[PDB]
Assembly symmetry: C3
Homo-oligomer: 427 residues x 3
């Protein structure tokens, strides 16, 4: 029963022409936003609408060019759903109510009104004035209890081998659908990372010291971080922790989907081979996306202090499956509705697995079409380089998410990184 | 039983080599266009093909490199379908017939021939001449009784608010599929518009005069046409009426799908804010698309005369649902197969709703793929600006319909409207 | 039971830290490539894992931050599948085994090890050392018995009429999916061509001499090769034979999918109207694709000698259907799993017909998405013109296969054929 004011306006009986608030039951109103104009009829008998309108020889069927009929029902003796159904049978187009099987078959809008408003219409009608109406509504937003819960156990490191390229490859291919699903209000996505604690046997180890932040509490998941690259296993732990804090901070602000733009831009902009697996590189992206560094940095804490890290401790506890899902033990792991996905990690494969969690004709568009696009360049140029003076930008929005790439203007492919400096090349 | 001449040609017994007309039963011929060459065998017994060929020790199975066998059956005593099945069992590749369950399992082409032709083959054969054949056919066109009926109740006005943008947004996204579906012969689409008549109480009203054409018979559906824009509710009624007449005129000429190119080009080219919601603007598009203005203008009539408007009167009568569909009372309303669609107004959502009205493997391509394109630029450059002297055009064909947009040539994005003037810009 | 060495490495008990070979049963390992780290526990009792671990009060459930448990099972008394299931129930994450209904419900990796290795772990453990592990695996390759068999009976000629354009049109639209399906290891595609032998009656005929290679054994399928174009029916027979030999030669080298790049490039580069239906034109493409001309030419043989042509003779024998499929008598004919396809010859239509031959969640990506691309430009520039000195190429990879088209560089559309010469145009 969603309440809006602009929904119910009163086309003139000019003495009471106005915009009133109502309460519309979710039944009888279609998925798409629409508008319904009509006029009000208040029956002299069967005013509860609990007995069948046919029994009284009352009918509401319209002639052509005639306004559809809004029946004024008084509440009592039976539910609104029955009032709406009874009215619908008699030929009503809507129902204005003043102050468990057939439910699917109710298709006329139902609105509750004030007694003070209902009385106005009744007297306006009794004087002889046509009381016309107008009833808008927006397209259906999914109920939050109906949204699919998926979760991803990933690793941010890139200097792995095949196993890390495939992961970052998935994040890039799914980013578009991931964002559309969640911005549309169909999915609760939570990313997770995996860390182990140092056994007492190897506390103050040479190994545990290059692997573990916070005095051994959280250590790098794979015991081969090829320190030859110059980056210890503990550097990975910190970077992952930053990603999780990027998520928490963005989730608290109502925009979790920005994680996808962080971890992909991190992959692009902060490579290990070029010695950019750094705080300063990550913090660059935090400016670009416009995330709160003070909050992210505070979430990360002091990875050198003999203290716990609530986020990293919660992740170690999330890895133990509760209820029916098992413990997460494989990197990566996709979980959809507290059940571990064991299929191919392809967008096509993963999307089918989730769209089965939707009810038919509650299916998001992203399930039925690839003709879609993220809407991220409308905010802050998506964090990519632009040039307001020349109307050019490096921001492009794609079925696979938002991209910062140096634009080709007047045939000239600009050269640069697209997040900070694009410029014209040569001939 | 489709009749074609070029379908049946007679590879030479040179005395009767020629191109004859036939009559092919729809059974035994596949969906795709193909060609079948063989040679004719006329059995001495079981010539009705009503008893089983096996009973007579007659068989038609071929050796390799050998031409497939065309059995010459005489009509009588049983249906063609049985003749074709009997022959098929014995090993026939086709059947030439001279002058309710197994039917699915018939897969060899069946053709009826003249007695004068059948006798020619029989004598040619009796002299000893191989009578070879060739049998072409085109891909299957859907039977018109099998096509899906959808209908859309829309509004052409644009200065509404959110509700009008979403509608015009749908027309633009669906235009490609809308056109492909109908040009392919799978859908009968009819657009509709909604108008109310002025009550006797408010005849000669100040309001009814700015809302209603034809002396009150047809009035603007929403009673807020924000006359501040300078355009009365009656201006909308006329524009909608023009759109419906664009449809009727184009439907009468066998090209209804041009409505989609009209209403989208109207949206683009005739905006209300720029004071282009005008006859002269609309008539511009009628030239571009090459529609008959004399017929469209005659359909619109004299919206100032005390007379009815058959199209607008038929629309007011179409709004009252007949049979099982209800009265259309919401703008917009999509109806598919005389049942009101109540889902999201997305292409993906709407296309699933219609492709369920097709039989499996009668499914149009547009149901199974997004790798498609309208074919509108082959006619008159789709009504967009071109430049024959430079091979450039503003016409582009898209999965979302035909677009007139100023081309980027040698890297130079041309500037203009793409329907009437494109030109080179600056540096 | 796939055997790899790099799959099983032993995170340190430093005295036995190393990379050992194993044998992983296909059960309990997901579709996606992943990695699993844990530590080994060797139970003192129930070491066959044949009785239920619960009966002994043995459990493997982990605390958080704790490494997942690898149970060391001794083989005997029951199958690995039961050992893995029993262990899984008790809370194991994997199983190390030393030296017909519930099977679906087994989800922990199972690996077999050497007795010499199993003993090492046992003694290492008995001294007190944590024996940790690491277990990688790649994404699942489909078993070759599970792949779909489709076959196409086509014609290479182009100067037909509508029937030949539609065929070449299909080859071009399907080439992308055709290649992806087969390179991914989901389909065995074999192309076929159709030829008839000259009847003794018309041996040494005027007609049979312009139609048939190898002294009449193999003749052009349609008896109208419009010799007005200058190309006899026997020229078509030879060109088709070359295509089939291109397939055989490429199939023998493990790259059959190159046929698709041959027959489409033949269509583009060797047209009949421009008198390019020549050996020298075809041999040009054989260089481009880098096919072995010596093998292809030897497969074609001497189409003028009184001899058989094994490939053309095998094709005439393949046309006679064996088992349940009929004789192929229509051009074109698509067969999927020894059953003749009778639907529309559209990619969308054809792909549904094949993806039904896959088990759910064994579905290739190409079945669930159009966001795909051939990977052909990584090899030899796909056979298209390039210019290494300028980083430009004519090779582009598409959902519809690999394309050689002259690139547009700095806004300048280059002009040429894209296989051999691209060059800058004018202004
Ligand atoms: C991310 O934000 C959401 C909502 O802001 C959080 O979800 C809530 O979690 C609490 C604690 O379990 C529940 O009682 C609420 O019902 C949840 N609200 C929802 C699901 O809308 C979520 O915990 C946040 N943090 C994450 C996901 O790590
Ligand atoms: C648009 O054109 C079609 C065909 O030209 C019209 O459809 C015919 O309508 C008459 C009257 O109801 C029927 O008897 C015919 O069977 C219809 N032919 C068909 C469906 O092929 C249609 O009425 C025209 N006008 C519209 C749709 O407004
Ligand atoms: C193309 O190559 C494949 C494999 O190299 C050939 O398939 C083999 O054919 C033999 C003979 O029938 C079988 O015994 C094998 O089991 C097949 N191997 C497979 C299917 O992997 C095939 O014959 C070759 N030639 C074609 C398809 O014309």
């Amino acid at each position: 029963f969603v309440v809006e004011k602009n929904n119910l306006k009163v086309t003139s009986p000019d003495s009471i022409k106005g915009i009133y608030e109502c309460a519309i039951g979710n039944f009888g109103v279609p998925q798409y936003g629409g508008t319904l104009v009509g006029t009000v009829v208040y029956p002299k008998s069967n005013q509860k609408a609990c007995k069948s309108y046919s029994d009284f020889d009352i009918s509401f069927k319209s002639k052509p060019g005639r306004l559809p009929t809004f029946v004024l029902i008084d509440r009592g003796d039976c539910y609104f759903t029955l009032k709406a159904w009874i009215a619908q049978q008699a030929g009503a187009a809507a129902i204005l109510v003043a102050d468990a099987d057939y439910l699917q078959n109710i298709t006329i809008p139902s609105a509750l009104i004030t007694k003070t408003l209902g009385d106005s219409i009744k007297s306006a009608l009794s004087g002889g004035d046509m009381v016309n109406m107008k009833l808008d509504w927006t397209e259906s937003v999914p109920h939050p209890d109906e949204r699919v819960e998926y979760e991803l156990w990933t690793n941010s490191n890139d200097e792995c081998g095949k196993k890390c390229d495939t992961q970052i490859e998935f994040l890039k291919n799914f980013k578009g659908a991931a964002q559309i699903l969640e911005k549309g209000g169909h999915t609760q996505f939570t990313p997770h990372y995996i860390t182990w604690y140092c056994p007492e046997a190897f506390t103050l180890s040479k190994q545990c010291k290059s692997q573990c932040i916070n005095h051994g509490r959280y250590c790098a998941p794979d015991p081969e971080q090829d320190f030859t690259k110059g980056y210890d296993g503990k550097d990975v732990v910190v970077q992952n922790l930053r990603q999780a804090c990027v998520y928490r901070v963005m989730n608290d602000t109502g925009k979790p989907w920005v994680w996808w733009d962080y971890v992909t831009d991190f992959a692009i902009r902060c490579p290990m081979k070029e010695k950019k697996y750094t705080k300063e590189c990550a913090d660059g992206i935090i400016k670009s996306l416009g995330i709160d560094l003070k909050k992210v940095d505070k979430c990360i804490g002091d990875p050198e202090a003999d203290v716990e890290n609530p986020v990293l401790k919660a992740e170690q506890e999330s890895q133990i499956g509760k209820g029916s899902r098992g413990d997460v033990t494989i990197l990566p792991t996709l979980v959809v509705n507290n059940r571990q996905y064991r299929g191919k990690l392809e967008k096509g494969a993963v999307l089918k697995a989730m769209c089965s969690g939707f009810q038919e004709s509650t299916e998001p568009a992203i399930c039925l079409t690839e003709d879609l696009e993220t809407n991220e360049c409308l905010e802050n140029n998506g964090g990519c380089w632009q040039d307001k003076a020349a109307n050019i930008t490096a921001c492009r929005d794609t079925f696979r998410g938002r991209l910062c790439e140096c634009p080709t203007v007047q045939g000239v492919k600009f050269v640069g990184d697209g997040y900070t400096h694009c410029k014209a090349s040569g001939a």
